[PDB]
């Protein structure tokens, strides 16, 4: 994985340059927020369940996969669901700590949506969830927040679609 | 683990014998009990987390520095840890009930009990005591219910207290 | 034992015994009764069992009791004996305790081995047990014959 | 109210007071929420006894940091992943130390040629093992090791240490590596990713049967008590009292012309500790006629 | 009682975790000298003390 | 020494009630023909199911030289 | 057993060479030090008793330990527990005056690990007295005088670990 | 492990107190410590192969230790002295900023007579090491560093002993 | 990087970032704009800093540029000047970063046998690095370049 | 040797030596003799072959003998002619051996570790292995030499 800096440093040294105007204004924007991406971290962390409820009763509740047929009916599949859920959220956060969505990829996009092809999980109902947990994140953390963690959460849902 | 009819059965492999007439007794008594044995076992389970939490209720009341602080179940944490010991016990009771015998009690239990407490400093008497307390309201319960027979449970609990318990004389 | 079997099942997922395994317990118990005759009359027979199912083994595989066999001998044809003796006990020890663990531990563990050691052959102690499970059926009922027939066939299929 | 009261009463500086907001939140967080699931562990097989443990006891004992080797892993967090693998097959860092190591296997691994599992696999049986953990032990105590360093803990019961033994006495250590790495507990714990690690007190719920056993065996001591602490306890518990000093098997002197010859505590471990209460007789050999002993014949 | 033991030695189980602990535990377990986000933490964490 | 290329996903069932770490069930994996019969095995106890597999090192019906 | 001075000596004997600069120094460091040893003993052996009382009633008394059924409860069981500490106490004033911890080895940590987990004896609690014992000396015998008997009694607490 | 904060959290528990009076001053030194103990720390870490360089120079080196016969003969061994030395500073380091050796206690001494004792390890060699150890980090961190330090390189010396 | 190190620990303990950990990522920002300074500086006086140190390094080992050694001419002493530019480049990466995590993952791991295979000695460009440290620091300020020393000593080191 | 490394393959496995390890130790047996001469050829010449050695790796080598360099000084060079020694005789004890287990057990395993925290370079070591390795090729024959030379090459590869 890497975050912004990373990213930065990699890219003058692919080409084998020291950091430029560009490089050097970035990093200022990354350190500028920072202090931003640490109280929504600290905030999600503090309200990490509070996000996955929310999420799911907005999301998943009283819906088709609660029915009986669908893969979130039973309570072991519940549960494993949920599971699933907040892994996405604490990964989601490590990524916007990051600046970088390599993290992702790295840990949670390698086989996932494959994994869920194979098992028959609702591919659909997964990116739907995952947006219910972008506007209760954006609620909880604020706009600013907000959007970080909506680019890493689409991220996700795409890399699953 | 080995039931009654396996001990009984090993015994008599010690010495290469055939099941005599005092072996047949014995197995007939255990078959005979064992109506009683799983009437027991069935009540246990239905009231067991009410008996152990009773007991703990009664323990902390009779010994009360467990709570206090230097007590030995004075967090939650503890306290949860403490209870999960008395769950254990009750169901390695009602295993041991079940089998007639007190092997399986203490393949699974007494072992390395006084090893283990006395590594995490836990007090080896308190918890005799609250074993004691679950037998207690084990037996009552089973007198009160409609058990004919329910001599036998005190004897996995009165293992464990033997057993667990320093030898004082 | 059916009874040691379903306690440790239950402990090895922690919890209580199961509905199930207390109906188990509960049949097996019921059934101990039957469970007392068959043995009751196997070891009153054991005698006459062991020595029919000798007979019909040293007339059936007259080469295990032939010079060069490894039963030959007066003295190896009652140590033969005396393992059909025990193999004997063993399946009474299994009948009082329903289940066919007794046998395992006592008598069907490096069995093969240890016959192989003393130059058996093992389809030759198969045989006898084989015998010595229809002279035992031929002594009981149609059920209970059946009941002893599964530890027999256990046997005979641990040793071969 | 607690949190009003300490917020209206310190009322300092947000550096100095979101602290205490922040941990007034936390516990009235924790206070709402549902008591957790207890972990449980399960019996591997019918040998060993389930096992359950609160969710609060594994929120403070320091929690293992696991590794997984992950495809995409870059080559740092790569770098760290092998050594932890190094050091949980070995007791130690034997490439940091000795620059031992097999980059033929590394490569294999870091390309995701061979998963987590068969590296273990591999590098367990390899020569680099073998001298260092297998050909320097009895069977037993190489079954021994071997649990902890495959399997993150130590014999479970005396026929657990029974059918390892036999399954080493057959195919040796490539057959007892086999049937650790292809058994229903490894793939449970680690799975196909994960490197193995130590689940001690803290980690899991640990049974009252091989206590001391497993204390012994996870301190870095362990491949230097050459005498197997797991079958000979093992066995001990099933038999009664043993010929034994009252206070340990290290206090019986060598029955030797002269010389005081003690079982050093220290030196190659060998400590059999009995429960032996107050009013237990010896059993002592007569060196004279039989009948002559005091214990019969007063 | 018992016909023989194991053998009793002292267990620490770490009753709860503070930042020092923390930092300390994970390069122990890593092999390690505390690097510069260990480092970080316990001078963050003592400045605030 | 003949190898298996094997492509299959195991999901875990006791997850929920060990509260462990979650993995990737689904691995590629080169596994000696050997150990193949009871890796097979245990990935068809464990419920996981193998989607490909595939003789990756050795040729087909080799009578010598298999190591 | 060793001291300080035994340990020197040993060291340059089976080096077979003769006592050079190293050696004169560590013997004078130990020479300087050993008025303050002295007066710590004569401390210890004057307060022997009472260290042990203050050490049992900050750590022992009123405690599960003493409760029916610990391995403390009977007045046999006390007074063994007593004379427990009473040898722990002589020694690590032995110790102490000798500058060294050979003693205690060849004495006690030899075999009391053994006999303690043959005994049922709780070393857990047994640790918690020492470590009491550690204070209750410190008080009497000083600050530096302290931290040397503390180095001796975490020498005993950890021999039993 | 514990620290000088969970002692202190642990004492005023069990007393069943608030930190009242002395608990506070001593973690109020303990922060006071804390800054320069960090410090100490990264020097001890950005030198760590020179410390063990020097010391092997100073103590080992060019003797019977070393010469064939020596405990330090071979290369392998000579190797695995070293790590032992990198281990001893490691967790010193790590007991100078917990405040505490019970570190040293639970990772180290657990096994480390047992382990040398089978081995055959010289006892006074390997402290004579840990003094050379001690002595050249001092020199190369400051009287008071090092006296800090050694507080706890010396209870691994008493350890050994 | 100490982003890095935090997610990957947080990954192995399965956990978020604790309150230390959130507090340690806070005054790595602050210092950022210190550490950013000095890396502006680096680069500045990264031409006449490589030129003086390669400079002093052929005054102090002159087996390297002379007869047998890996500097001959001027097309050797390109390539070593560039190898040092790299490394001095890799530090500055080292120090914006904040975590010898970058100069590791670019070059730090198989150097040693890189420099065997091109048999330019490793101790030479480590001494080599160290004058490129004493340089740097009497061009910047003393107090301020002990954070480039901490990375400059750590590479030297890791070489060594 | 070549029977310790049979034997413990064949204890790994748990099984007997076969006799395609049983011929191959027995022509390693039948063929000593010229092991053993090689071995006292090489004893014999050891102060010669060490001097040579030394001799010719300082004259191609002046940094090392140089100031600040790691043989540096009278007791250093002594030193460095010691640790040729030293290599030498493991070469001796690996010829006679037929194998290289004994030199790897002995001065092989964290070489590189201990000459790192000595300071001396591993490249210059196996330069001085190797000018050993010549001055015994001069001073054995054809077939001799070239036999010696394979631990000679051994050692020199698996320092660098
Ligand atoms: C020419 C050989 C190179 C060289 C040598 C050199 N070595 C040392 C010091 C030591 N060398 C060893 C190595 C070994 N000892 C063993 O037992 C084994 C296997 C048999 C090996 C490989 C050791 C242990 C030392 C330490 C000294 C001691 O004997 O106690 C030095 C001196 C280092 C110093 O600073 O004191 C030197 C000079 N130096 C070169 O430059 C050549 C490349
Ligand atoms: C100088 C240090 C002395 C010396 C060292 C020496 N040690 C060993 C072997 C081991 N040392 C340890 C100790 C530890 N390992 C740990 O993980 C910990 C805590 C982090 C400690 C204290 C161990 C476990 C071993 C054996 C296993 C291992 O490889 O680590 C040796 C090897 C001896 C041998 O012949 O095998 C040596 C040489 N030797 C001296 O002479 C110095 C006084
Ligand atoms: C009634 C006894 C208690 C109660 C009910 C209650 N339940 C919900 C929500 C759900 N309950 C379920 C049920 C199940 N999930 C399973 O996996 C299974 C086992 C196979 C069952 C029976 C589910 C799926 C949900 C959520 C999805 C859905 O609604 O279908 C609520 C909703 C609470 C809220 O805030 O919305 C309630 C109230 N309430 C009580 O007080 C009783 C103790
Ligand atoms: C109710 C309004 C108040 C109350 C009463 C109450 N408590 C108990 C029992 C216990 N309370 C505790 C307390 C704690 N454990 C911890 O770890 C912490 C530290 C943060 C605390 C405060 C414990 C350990 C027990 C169990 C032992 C005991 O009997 O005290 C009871 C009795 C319940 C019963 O009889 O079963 C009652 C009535 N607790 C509150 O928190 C309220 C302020
Ligand atoms: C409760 C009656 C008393 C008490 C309990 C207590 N126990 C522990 C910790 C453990 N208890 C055990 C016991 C067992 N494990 C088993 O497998 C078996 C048989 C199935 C038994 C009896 C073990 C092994 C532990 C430690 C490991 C674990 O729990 O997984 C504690 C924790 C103490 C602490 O400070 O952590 C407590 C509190 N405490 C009392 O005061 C009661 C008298
Ligand atoms: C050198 C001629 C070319 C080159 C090399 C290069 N390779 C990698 C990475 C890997 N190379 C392999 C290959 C093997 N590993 C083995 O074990 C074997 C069979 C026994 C082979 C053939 C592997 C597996 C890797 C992956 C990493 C690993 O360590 O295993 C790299 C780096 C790749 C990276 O992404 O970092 C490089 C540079 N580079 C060239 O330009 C040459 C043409
Ligand atoms: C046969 C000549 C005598 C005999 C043997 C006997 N042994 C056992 C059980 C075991 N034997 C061993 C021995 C070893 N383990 C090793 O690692 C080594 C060297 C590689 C040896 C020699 C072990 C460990 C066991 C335990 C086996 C197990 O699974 O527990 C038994 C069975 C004992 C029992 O069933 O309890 C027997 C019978 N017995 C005699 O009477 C012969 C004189
Ligand atoms: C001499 C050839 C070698 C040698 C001898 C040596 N021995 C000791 C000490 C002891 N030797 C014994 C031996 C026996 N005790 C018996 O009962 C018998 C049976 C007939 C024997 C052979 C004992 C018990 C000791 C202990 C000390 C004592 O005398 O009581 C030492 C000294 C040990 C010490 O540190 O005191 C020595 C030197 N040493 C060599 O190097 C020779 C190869
Ligand atoms: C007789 C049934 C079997 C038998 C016996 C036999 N025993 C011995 C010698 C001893 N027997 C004991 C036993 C005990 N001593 C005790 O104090 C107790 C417990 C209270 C017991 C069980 C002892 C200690 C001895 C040694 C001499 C002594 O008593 O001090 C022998 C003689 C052996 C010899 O070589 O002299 C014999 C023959 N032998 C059989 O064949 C029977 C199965
Ligand atoms: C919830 C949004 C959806 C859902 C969930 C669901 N998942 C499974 C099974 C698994 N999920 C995982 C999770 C991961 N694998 C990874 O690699 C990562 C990161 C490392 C994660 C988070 C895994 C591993 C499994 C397999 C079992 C295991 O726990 O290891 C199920 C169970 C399916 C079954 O019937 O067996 C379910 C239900 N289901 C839905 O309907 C939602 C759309
Ligand atoms: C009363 C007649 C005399 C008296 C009593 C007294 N005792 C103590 C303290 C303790 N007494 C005991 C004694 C026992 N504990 C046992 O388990 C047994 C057998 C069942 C006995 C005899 C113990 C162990 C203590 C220590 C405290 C504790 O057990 O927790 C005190 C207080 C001592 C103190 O300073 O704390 C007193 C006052 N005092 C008299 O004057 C009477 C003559």
């Known amino acids: 994985m890497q975050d912004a800096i990373t990213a930065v440093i990699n890219s003058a040294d692919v080409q084998g340059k020291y950091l430029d105007g560009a490089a050097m204004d970035k990093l200022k924007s990354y350190f500028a927020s920072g202090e931003l991406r640490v109280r929504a971290a600290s905030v999600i962390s503090a309200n990490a369940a509070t996000i996955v409820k929310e999420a799911v009763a907005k999301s998943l509740l009283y819906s088709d996969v609660t029915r009986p047929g669908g893969n979130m009916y039973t309570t072991r599949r519940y549960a494993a669901c949920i599971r699933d859920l907040d892994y996405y959220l604490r990964y989601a956060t490590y990524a916007m700590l990051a600046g970088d969505a390599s993290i992702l990829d790295e840990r949670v996009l390698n086989g996932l949506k494959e994994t869920y092809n194979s098992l028959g999980v609702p591919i659909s109902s997964t990116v739907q969830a995952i947006q219910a947990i972008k506007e209760v994140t954006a609620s909880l953390v604020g706009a600013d927040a907000g959007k970080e963690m909506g680019v890493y959460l689409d991220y996700i849902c795409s890399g699953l679609s | 683990m080995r039931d009654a009819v396996t001990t009984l059965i090993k015994n008599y492999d010690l010495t290469g014998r055939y099941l005599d007439r005092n072996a047949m007794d014995e197995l007939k008594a255990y078959f005979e009990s064992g109506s009683a044995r799983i009437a027991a076992a069935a009540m246990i389970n239905a009231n067991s987390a009410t008996i152990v939490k009773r007991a703990a209720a009664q323990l902390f009341e009779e010994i009360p520095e467990l709570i206090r602080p230097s007590g030995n179940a004075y967090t939650t944490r503890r306290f949860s840890a403490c209870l999960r010991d008395m769950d254990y016990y009750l169901r390695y009771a009602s295993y041991a009930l079940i089998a007639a015998d007190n092997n399986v009690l203490d393949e699974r239990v007494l072992q390395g009990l006084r090893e283990t407490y006395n590594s995490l400093g836990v007090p080896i008497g308190p918890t005799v005591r609250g074993i004691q307390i679950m037998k207690e309201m084990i037996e009552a319960m089973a007198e009160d219910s409609s058990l004919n027979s329910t001599d036998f449970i005190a004897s996995p609990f009165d293992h464990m207290t033997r057993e667990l318990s320093e030898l004082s004389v | 034992s059916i009874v040691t079997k379903s306690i440790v099942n239950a402990d090895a997922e922690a919890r209580y015994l199961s509905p199930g395994e207390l109906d188990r317990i509960k049949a097996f118990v019921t059934g101990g009764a039957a469970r007392l005759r068959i043995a009751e009359t196997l070891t009153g027979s054991r005698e006459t069992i062991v020595k029919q199912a000798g007979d019909r083994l040293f007339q059936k595989r007259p080469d295990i009791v032939s010079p060069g066999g490894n039963a030959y001998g007066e003295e190896m044809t009652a140590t033969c004996l005396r393992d059909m003796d025990y193999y004997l006990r063993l399946v009474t020890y299994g009948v009082v305790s329903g289940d066919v663990t007794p046998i395992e531990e006592i008598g069907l563990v490096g069995v093969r081995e240890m016959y192989r050691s003393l130059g058996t052959p093992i389809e030759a102690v198969a045989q006898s047990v084989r015998e010595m499970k229809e002279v035992a059926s031929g002594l009981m009922s149609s059920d209970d014959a059946a009941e002893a027939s599964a530890y027999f066939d256990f046997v005979i299929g641990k040793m071969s | 109210e607690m949190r009003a009261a300490s917020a209206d009463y310190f009322r300092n500086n947000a550096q100095a007071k979101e602290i205490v907001l922040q941990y007034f939140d936390i516990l009235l967080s924790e206070f709402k929420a549902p008591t957790p699931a207890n972990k449980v562990r399960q019996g591997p097989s019918n040998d060993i006894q389930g096992l359950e443990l609160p969710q609060s006891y594994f929120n403070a004992a320091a929690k293992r940091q696991k590794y997984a080797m992950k495809p995409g892993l870059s080559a740092l967090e790569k770098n760290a992943v092998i050594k932890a693998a190094y050091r949980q097959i070995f007791e130690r860092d034997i490439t940091k130390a000795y620059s031992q190591s097999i980059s033929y296997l590394e490569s294999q691994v870091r390309n995701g040629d061979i998963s987590m599992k068969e590296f273990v696999r591999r590098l367990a049986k390899s020569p680099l093992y073998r001298k260092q953990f297998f050909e320097p032990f009895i069977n037993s105590r190489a079954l021994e090791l071997a649990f902890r360093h495959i399997l993150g803990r130590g014999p479970s019961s005396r026929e657990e240490v029974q059918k390892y033994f036999s399954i080493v006495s057959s195919g040796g250590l490539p057959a007892l590596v086999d049937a650790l790495v292809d058994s229903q507990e490894y793939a449970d714990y680690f799975g196909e990713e994960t490197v193995p690690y130590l689940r001690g007190l803290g980690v899991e719920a640990q049974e009252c049967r091989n206590w001391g056993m497993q204390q012994d065996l996870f301190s870095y001591s362990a491949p230097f008590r050459k005498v197997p602490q797991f079958i000979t306890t093992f066995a001990q518990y099933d038999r009664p009292l043993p010929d034994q000093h009252v206070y340990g098997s290290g206090n019986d002197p060598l029955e030797i012309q002269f010389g005081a010859i003690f079982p050093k505590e220290t030196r190659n471990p060998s400590k059999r500790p009995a429960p032996f209460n107050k009013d237990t007789k010896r059993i002592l050999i007569h060196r004279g006629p039989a009948v002559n002993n005091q214990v019969g014949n007063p | 009682s018992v016909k023989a033991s194991g053998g009793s030695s002292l267990a620490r189980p770490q009753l709860y975790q503070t930042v020092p602990v923390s930092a300390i535990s994970q390069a122990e377990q890593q092999d390690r000298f505390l690097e510069g986000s260990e480092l970080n933490e316990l001078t963050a964490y003592f400045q605030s003390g | ?67």
């Not at chain 6, 069932?13 to 023909?33: A, C, D, G, M, S």
């Not at chain 6, 890796?39 to 989607?51: A, D, P």
Request: net charge positive; charged share 25%.
């Open chain 6, 1 to 67: 020494m003949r190898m298996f290329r094997i492509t299959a996903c195991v999901p875990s069932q006791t997850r929920i009630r060990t509260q462990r770490e979650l993995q990737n069930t689904y691995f590629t994996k080169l596994v000696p023909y050997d150990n193949w019969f009871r890796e097979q095995q245990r990935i068809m106890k464990m419920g996981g199911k193998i989607v490909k597999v595939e003789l990756a090192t050795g040729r087909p019906g080799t009578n010598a030289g298999l190591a």
